Amino acid sequence: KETAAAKFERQHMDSSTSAASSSNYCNQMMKSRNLTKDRCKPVNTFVHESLADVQAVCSQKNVACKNGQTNCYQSYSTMSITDCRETGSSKYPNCAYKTTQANKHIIVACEGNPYVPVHFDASV
């Protein structure tokens, strides 16, 4: 079984590199993280930070999630992230992505005991 927290890790965590190594990073990662299995996930963000530092955001700044839910939290510090979004070339099973490096505050939705991130919401 993959808990929501385990899923958050697979879909969004990548402590292995300090930033996207190439313009081809997203194509490689979207595939290895199984995000192109039954369709091409349209957009996905990877966080290049320790899991401990990301988990700590659940006890930082409480803000509203994009859908109006209230269980979202914003990081005080900026974090190294990579934005992956489909290009016009993308057509399942040939999913294609644009890789974009950024340094922004992250917003995650938290849930549970322990209270940890379970959904990546936005970046500001």
Side-chain angles (χ1 to χ4, degrees):
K1 191 185 57 176
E2 202 171 41
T3 63
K7 290 236 315 98
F8 170 88
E9 293 177 48
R10 167 179 62 81
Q11 299 199 296
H12 308 286
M13 294 303 301
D14 190 17
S15 312
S16 85
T17 190
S18 63
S21 34
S22 66
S23 56
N24 205 54
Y25 172 85
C26 286
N27 276 344
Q28 295 167 159
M29 294 292 301
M30 286 302 282
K31 183 82 91 323
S32 57
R33 293 306 177 81
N34 226 3
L35 308 185
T36 61
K37 191 192 196 300
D38 288 307
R39 82 276 192 250
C40 305
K41 192 177 191 285
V43 174
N44 188 74
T45 304
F46 289 99
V47 185
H48 307 295
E49 301 287 344
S50 72
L51 180 67
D53 288 327
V54 171
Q55 287 179 323
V57 178
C58 291
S59 68
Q60 288 168 33
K61 190 165 296 168
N62 185 219
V63 301
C65 304
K66 285 183 167 182
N67 64 0
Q69 298 313 252
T70 57
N71 68 317
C72 284
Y73 294 84
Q74 189 179 304
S75 59
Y76 291 131
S77 304
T78 57
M79 297 194 182
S80 179
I81 67 168
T82 294
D83 176 83
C84 298
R85 60 193 260 141
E86 282 187 301
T87 63
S89 177
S90 193
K91 176 184 165 187
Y92 182 88
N94 298 293
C95 304
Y97 298 91
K98 170 181 186 53
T99 297
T100 297
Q101 302 178 316
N103 290 90
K104 299 173 144 197
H105 303 270
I106 69 163
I107 300 170
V108 293
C110 302
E111 217 172 67
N113 183 185
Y115 202 61
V116 299
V118 299
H119 153 76
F120 184 89
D121 201 58
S123 65
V124 297

